[PDB]
UniProtKB/Swiss-Prot annotation, chain A:
Note: EBNA1 is possibly linked to multiple sclerosis in the host. Antibodies that recognize both EBNA1 and the host protein HEPACAM/GlialCAM can be produced when B cells undergo somatic hypermutations. A mimicry has also been proposed between ANO2 (Anoctamin 2) and EBNA1.
Effect of substituting R18A: Impaired cooperative DNA binding
Protein role: Responsible for the origin of replication (oriP) dependent replication and maintenance of viral episomes during latent infection. EBNA1 dimer interacts with the DS (dyad symmetry) element within the origin of replication oriP and with a host mitotic chromosome to initiate viral DNA replication during latency. EBNA1 binding to DS recruits the host origin recognition complex (ORC). Governs the faithful mitotic segregation of the viral episomes by binding both the FR (family of repeats) element within oriP and the host mitotic chromosomes.
Protein name: Epstein-Barr nuclear antigen 1
Subcellular locations according to the entry: Host nucleus
Ranges annotated as spanning the membrane: none
Assembly: Homodimer. Dimers can assemble into higher-order oligomers like a homohexamer. Binding to the DS element involves 2 dimers of EBNA1. Interacts with human USP7; this interaction is independent and simultaneous to EBNA1 interaction with CSNK2B as well as necessary for PML nuclear bodies disruption by EBNA1. Interacts with host CSNK2B (via KSSR motif); the interaction requires phosphorylation of EBNA1, is independent and simultaneous to EBNA1 interaction with USP7 as well as necessary for PML nuclear bodies disruption by EBNA1. EBNA1, USP7 and CSNK2B form a ternary complex.
Region described as DBD/DD: spans on this chain: 1-134
Record note on domains: The N-terminus contains the region UR1 that binds zinc and is essential for EBNA1 to activate transcription. This domain dimerizes upon coordinating. The Gly-Gly-Ala repeat region (GAr) inhibits the mRNA translation of EBNA1 in cis and thus prevents MHC-I restricted presentation of EBNA1 epitopes to the host cytotoxic T cells. The chromosome-tethering regions contain Gly-Arg (GR) repeats that function as AT hooks and are involved in EBNA1 stable replication and partition of episomes. The C-terminus DNA binding and dimerization domain (DBD/DD) is required for the viral latent DNA replication.
């Protein structure tokens, strides 16, 4: 009944179908992920809903906001708590190999869409000691 | 320093405790590249204890950048909800710290672990792990 989220799910599934790497481990620990950001709040939200449908094996944070980076010039840097309008969400995964596959699928999916969707960025991330999701 | 009535806010005391621990480690906090390639992922405790830790971390460390507080999903066997399992939100909170160096992320992870162990529950239940971002995060 949510055609927008289902159409994103189908786009992701079509891309993820090219790979057969393991998505879970016997340990079940959350040791990798994909960090997804930019675009717009709504385009990220839509991508998050489609990711949830396409990947039952992942876990997702809500959207939240990124802080600023470095400011050019000699003027003051932003304080560490200052929030931008750029949003992000995190995908938690049990294998790094599937994180890499998902990162590539998200990149390939969003580049076929108009702005602001094509401005979504993604990087793999790893958690040294894992994240003990509750 | 001592505030009115012989008390400081918890976040100020966190900042001072972190400053003391971090002074033990003379490691690089920035790079010429300036890229945000490392982090610490801080979670658990309670919303109030994380609130104080986040505010104290900011005060102690100008070289870092912090997300707001937010919520974690469940791991195995999520709780109920009308939406898919991967989206269901627990009551456990988290924040992230972005950093320019891997070594300082390690030092900060150790400092937070050491500091929260000296506090009463629920602060001592806060968890932390280093993280790394393969391609960096292009903070705005
Ligand atoms: C910021 C922001 O932008 N969209 C969001 N929603 C979710 O991530 C899932 S629904 C909960 C809600 O929206 O309050 C949030 Br939080
Ligand atoms: O809704 C979005 O912005 C979106 C997000 C991620 C991937 C595809 C999307 N899309 C865009 C048009 C049709 C699908």
């Amino acid at each position: 009944s949510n055609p927008k989220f289902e159409n994103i799910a189908e786009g992701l599934r079509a891309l993820l179908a090219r790979s057969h790497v393991e998505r879970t481990t016997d340990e079940g620990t959350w040791v990798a992920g994909v960090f997804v950001y930019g675009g717009s709040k709504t385009s990220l939200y839509n991508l998050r809903r489609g990711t949830a449908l396409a990947i039952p094996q992942c876990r997702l944070t809500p959207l939240s906001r990124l802080p600023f980076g470095m400011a050019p010039g000699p003027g003051p840097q932003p304080g560490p708590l200052r929030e931008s309008i750029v949003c992000y969400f995190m995908v938690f995964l049990q294998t790094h190999i599937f994180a890499e596959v998902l990162k590539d699928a998200i990149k390939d999916l969003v580049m076929t869409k108009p702005a602001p969707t094509c401005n979504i960025r993604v990087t793999v991330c790893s958690f040294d000691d894992g994240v003990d999701l509750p």
